[PDB]
Amino acid sequence: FLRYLWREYLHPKEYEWVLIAGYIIVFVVALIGNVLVCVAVWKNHHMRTVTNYFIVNLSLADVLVTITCLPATLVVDITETWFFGQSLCKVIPYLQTVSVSVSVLTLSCIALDRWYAICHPLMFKSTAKRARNSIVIIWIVSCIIMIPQAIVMECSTVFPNKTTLFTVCDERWGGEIYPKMYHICFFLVTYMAPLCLMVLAYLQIFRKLWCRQGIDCSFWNESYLTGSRDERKKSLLSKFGMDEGVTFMFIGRFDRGQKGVDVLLKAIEILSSKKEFQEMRFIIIGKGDPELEGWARSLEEKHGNVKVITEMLSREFVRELYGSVDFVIIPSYFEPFGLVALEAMCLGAIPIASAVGGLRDIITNETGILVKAGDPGELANAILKALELSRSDLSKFRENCKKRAMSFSKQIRARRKTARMLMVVLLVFAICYLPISILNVLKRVFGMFAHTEDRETVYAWFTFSHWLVYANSAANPIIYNFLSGKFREEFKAAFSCCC
Ligand SMILES: CCN(Cc1cccnc1)C(=O)CN(c1ccc(OC)nc1)S(=O)(=O)c1ccccc1C
Ligand SMILES: CCCCCCCC/C=C/CCCCCCCC(=O)O
Ligand SMILES: CCCCCCCC/C=C\CCCCCCCC(=O)O
Ligand SMILES: CCCCCCCC/C=C\CCCCCCCC(=O)O
Numbered sequence: 001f002l003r004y005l006w007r008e009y010l011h012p013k014e015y016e017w018v019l020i021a022g023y024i025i026v027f028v029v030a031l032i033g034n035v036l037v038c039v040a041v042w043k044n045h046h047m048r049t050v051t052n053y054f055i056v057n058l059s060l061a062d063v064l065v066t067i068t069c070l071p072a073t074l075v076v077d078i079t080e081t082w083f084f085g086q087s088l089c090k091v092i093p094y095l096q097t098v099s100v101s102v103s104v105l106t107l108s109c110i111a112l113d114r115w116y117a118i119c120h121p122l123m124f125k126s127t128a129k130r131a132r133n134s135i136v137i138i139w140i141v142s143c144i145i146m147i148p149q150a151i152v153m154e155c156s157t158v159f160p161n162k163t164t165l166f167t168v169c170d171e172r173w174g175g176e177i178y179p180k181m182y183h184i185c186f187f188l189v190t191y192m193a194p195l196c197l198m199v200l201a202y203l204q205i206f207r208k209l210w211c212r213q214g215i216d217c218s219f220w221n222e223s224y225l226t227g228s229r230d231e232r233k234k235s236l237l238s239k240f241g242m243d244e245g246v247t248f249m250f251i252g253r254f255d256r257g258q259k260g261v262d263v264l265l266k267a268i269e270i271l272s273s274k275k276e277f278q279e280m281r282f283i284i285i286g287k288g289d290p291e292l293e294g295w296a297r298s299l300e301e302k303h304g305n306v307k308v309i310t311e312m313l314s315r316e317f318v319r320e321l322y323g324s325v326d327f328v329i330i331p332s333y334f335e336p337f338g339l340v341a342l343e344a345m346c347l348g349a350i351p352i353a354s355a356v357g358g359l360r361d362i363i364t365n366e367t368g369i370l371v372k373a374g375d376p377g378e379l380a381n382a383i384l385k386a387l388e389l390s391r392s393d394l395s396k397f398r399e400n401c402k403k404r405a406m407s408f409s410k411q412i413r414a415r416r417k418t419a420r421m422l423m424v425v426l427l428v429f430a431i432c433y434l435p436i437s438i439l440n441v442l443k444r445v446f447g448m449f450a451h452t453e454d455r456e457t458v459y460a461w462f463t464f465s466h467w468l469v470y471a472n473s474a475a476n477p478i479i480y481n482f483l484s485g486k487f488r489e490e491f492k493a494a495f496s497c498c499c
Pocket of ligand 1 (some may be wrong): 069073076092093094096097100169170186190191433436437440465466467469470
């Protein structure tokens with residue numbers, strides 16, 4: 001008898017079986033998965049990155065609503081009734097909307113941290129303190145900007161002589177204007193503005209990481225060289241009509257203010273009055289400013305130990321140069337990436353480079369000679385230092401260079417995998433939150449569904465959009481499992497230790 005009056009009162013929806021099944025599944029997967037995300041980062045020091053601290057924040061927001069909001073949303077969508085009283089009518093929508101804000105601002109800070117790391121020339125000194133500060137800000141801002149949402153939620157009773165009633169929890173507005181302006185702002189803040197800004201940031205990240213950085217490691221590879229470096233250097237100098245000696249190469253456009261050939265040509269003039277010059281060989285490859293081409297050709301004419309190549313060389317020829325010269329001179333004024341240094345170093349050539357940009361990122365004190373950009377006397381001094389180094393075995397130096405370039409290349413690949421995972425996370429968020437965000441706008445800004453001819457269908461769309469929001473929480477740990485080997489390994493460790 002006790003279930004009877006309630007079943008007479010609560011009219012079943014034909015699809016409640018699948019709604020309940022889908023909520024139970026999402027509940028279990030989101031709870032276990034997001035807890036294991038937190039456990040993986042907290043227990044394993046190699047997982048401590050700013051990115052993963054933000055991911056932990058995302059997983060905490062998702063645990064919060066999985067436990068406090070999802071069960072209530074299921075009951076409401078099944079019964080169209082609010083059972084939980086007035087205070088929880090404010091608290092539960094408040095937690096839900098706070099968590100949406102936390103999620104999207106956390107995704108935003110993830111995108112900014114990757115943009116500063118990859119696209120901005122500088123680097124933050126703080127990492128974990130900066131992440132902590134950002135997370136605190138995210139929660140403070142989120143809790144404050146959703147105060148209005150908590151203010152407008154109210155319980156209302158409706159009496160269909162009355163013998164019955166029902167109570168719903170809903171936004172209470174005085175007038176038609178306020179909900180329109182409020183839900184415009186709500187849409188911009190939770191969905192439209194951060195998504196547009198993150199799409200822009202990840203497009204620039206993609207363009208820098210995939211199109212402006214990286215080296216083809218299957219090609220720039222010493223496996224393709226034959227004989228000893230001594231044999232190849234001797235062959236190289238024989239083919240270029242030069243005597244044996246310490247061999248320097250430059251390759252790049254000829255200009256004033258970018259690639260530095262002007263600095264190198266001045267450095268050669270400085271060196272040319274010194275007796276050490278006679279031990280040095282220069283190979284200068286490039287094309288561009290005709291006054292600089294003429295300066296270079298004038299030097300080639302003056303000096304038997306200077307050769308200038310303005311013709312186009314195949315990449316295989318260049319690889320042979322990198323694998324036989326002693327040093328590569330990279331006297332850039334400006335060099336965001338420094339592909340020349342990575343290619344040369346992969347092949348054992350030791351770089352002498354300006355301390356700018358990506359050259360400064362790549363080259364350490366055991367893997368090259370850094371010089372102040374723009375300074376021919378400094379470059380001349382570095383070339384003299386390289387001559388003196390070359391009077392002894394350079395093997396360990398060449399090995400250090402190869403290893404550093406491989407390690408830098410590995411880091412680029414790792415950043416690509418992480419960025420790809422983060423873009424998939426963003427795409428899945430955009431998808432999971434599109435229906436509820438657009439339904440909310442159509443209903444509250446444009447007044448759709450006011451007097452609808454098919455309330456059943458509209459109600460079904462809203463119920464699905466709510467489920468899809470919680471399903472996002474279940475999806476994120478699954479994404480980390482497929483696109484991060486580090487998360488995949490710690491998840492497997494968890495499932496294997498408990499079974
Ligand atoms: C104004 C908030 N909003 C729009 C919205 C856009 C984008 C992302 N989340 C919510 C809503 O649709 C409304 N909200 C809502 C409903 C169900 C649900 O399930 C994921 N999520 C949110 S609500 O006002 O906080 C509310 C109302 C009545 C009962 C429970 C809840 C949570
Ligand atoms: C994805 C892994 C799935 C694990 C298997 C467990 C599946 C259990 C799901 C819950 C079934 C819920 C169906 C109950 C609906 C009954 C409808 C009703 O009578 O009101
Ligand atoms: C085994 C788990 C299944 C996954 C659950 C997916 C959750 C689906 C949520 C409800 C969508 C409602 C679809 C109802 C169709 C229209 C009903 C109607 O028009 O009256
Ligand atoms: C007995 C299983 C039921 C418990 C569900 C556990 C919650 C799921 C949490 C994260 C799922 C990640 C696992 C996906 C594995 C496939 C990926 C792969 O093969 O590399």
